[PDB]
Design an enzyme around this catalytic site. Sequence first.
Site: not given
Lengths: 75, 377, 147
Positions: B347-349, B325, C85
């Site tokens: 998902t972002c990592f 991300s 995020c």
Amino acid sequence: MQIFVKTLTGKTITLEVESSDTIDNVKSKIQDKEGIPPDQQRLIFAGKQLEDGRTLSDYNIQKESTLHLVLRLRG
Amino acid sequence: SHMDEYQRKIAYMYDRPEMAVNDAQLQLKVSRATTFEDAYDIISKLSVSDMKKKLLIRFRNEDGLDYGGVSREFFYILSHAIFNPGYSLFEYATDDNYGLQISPLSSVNPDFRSYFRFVGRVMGLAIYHRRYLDVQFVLPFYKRILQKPLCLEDVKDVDEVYYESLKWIKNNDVDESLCLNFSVEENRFGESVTVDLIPNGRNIAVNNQNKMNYLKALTEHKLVTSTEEQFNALKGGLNELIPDSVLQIFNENELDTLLNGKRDIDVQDWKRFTDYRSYTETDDIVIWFWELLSEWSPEKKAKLLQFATGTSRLPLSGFKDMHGSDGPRKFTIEKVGHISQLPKAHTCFNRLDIPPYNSKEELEQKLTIAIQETAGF
Amino acid sequence: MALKRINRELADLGKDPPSSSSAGPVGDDLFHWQATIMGPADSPYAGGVFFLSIHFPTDYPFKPPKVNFTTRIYHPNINSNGSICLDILRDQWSPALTISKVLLSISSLLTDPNPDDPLVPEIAHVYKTDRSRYELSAREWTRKYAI
């Protein structure tokens, strides 16, 4: 009774509900009026986070209650 | 099926009288270190008649048999060199979703036409001589090569969030609170400049009666008009060898298969460039996981990759230069959760939380169930 | 659209601020904003001040801004680098959202940490098992760093 919800886009949505109406029924009405899935709804009522399977009276919700629609937290 | 029709199309294309290779042989010597420079020096001077002869590629001071393997390695190196974003010719659509597209900044060069004609010649040579590149463009690129109309949905392949915002504008009404108008700000080398979608467009706000034209202009400018000259040169170079009457029997997927072959995900690179949290490389839930990934079909591996990382597309250099991300973030495997729960994914990592199971069969069942809702390729 | 919108947001913030958070450009660069968030009084981070850096992409408002914490915070959903995020900034973003909505969402996150998003699995496990220890650690970190 009638309640009001402020969504992300600044639009205020009015819902005709009852004190005994469950959270699921209110979310279903919101989805019917707007298409927002109940699972994606994160409503705040005076700092209280609403949960499915409960009723409005469980949250001390009264006439012309105003809620906010904050977004989900994932980090 | 789809494959049989594609094979019939390939046979018909290669059976055309206008795509027959000549009997004479053409030599092509390139040093391994300076592949790009020598390739551009030689290819950008060959005649169209010469490029149709048999291609015989010999690396400098590396003499051996199986010239087919040598040619394949040369095309692999050249495709990973010219299409490399660091060369300022192409660029990823997004850093977290790696998709190659023509870089608008590439116009800064004094003469980009020669370089893009060389790229077109390289692609035409790869298609002509039954050799595969290994780059993965975006679908709008292929739809442009075949000259197909581009619509709003095509932005889904390029950038997901941009498409979601455009769809939001299309569906919900627009007020005057939003300061949206017919102008796009592009930051080119520090300085930001304004481009008007329509004449005197920077002083026309979008009402509920203009947002359709606004979406049309935005899609056209984002996908086409920003890269007119460069793609015109590239397509001229490509059509120099392959007539347009031949490319126009495929579609945006058959052409991708023809260029890059049947896409596959390497597992050796995946294992060599992963890291673990609370897991050691000898732990059972790691060796079982890698055996399962070894004996799996490419579609299911792509589905797992999309489920864990977030997208099914990989960087141009494998899992080594993988972005998260905020920055580089290699594929991570973690021990988080109870036995009964399914594997989870952040998902972002690029994190995959696999609980400590007790047998390989249970791991296989849980991992196959957990990825069903994810569709890859 | 990427500058008029930013000026509109700045004007709106300068007229009726949320009375807790503040935001402003650093020097003269409208695409790089500093933000200050007051520690909520109903959360262990009370009495502290936190700083955020916001980068507006050139595709604004179509692409969400990138916000990052600067002061350290012992939180399950905030990492050491401070990356965030959450859906209001990566998944559920629409052109109607302003920068004040993001600040309000973050200030609400500082009071209601997610239970099942273990960005820091140790801290998430502590939160799920020993709430008192988690709150004590959060207050200690706020005392050490926020001031």
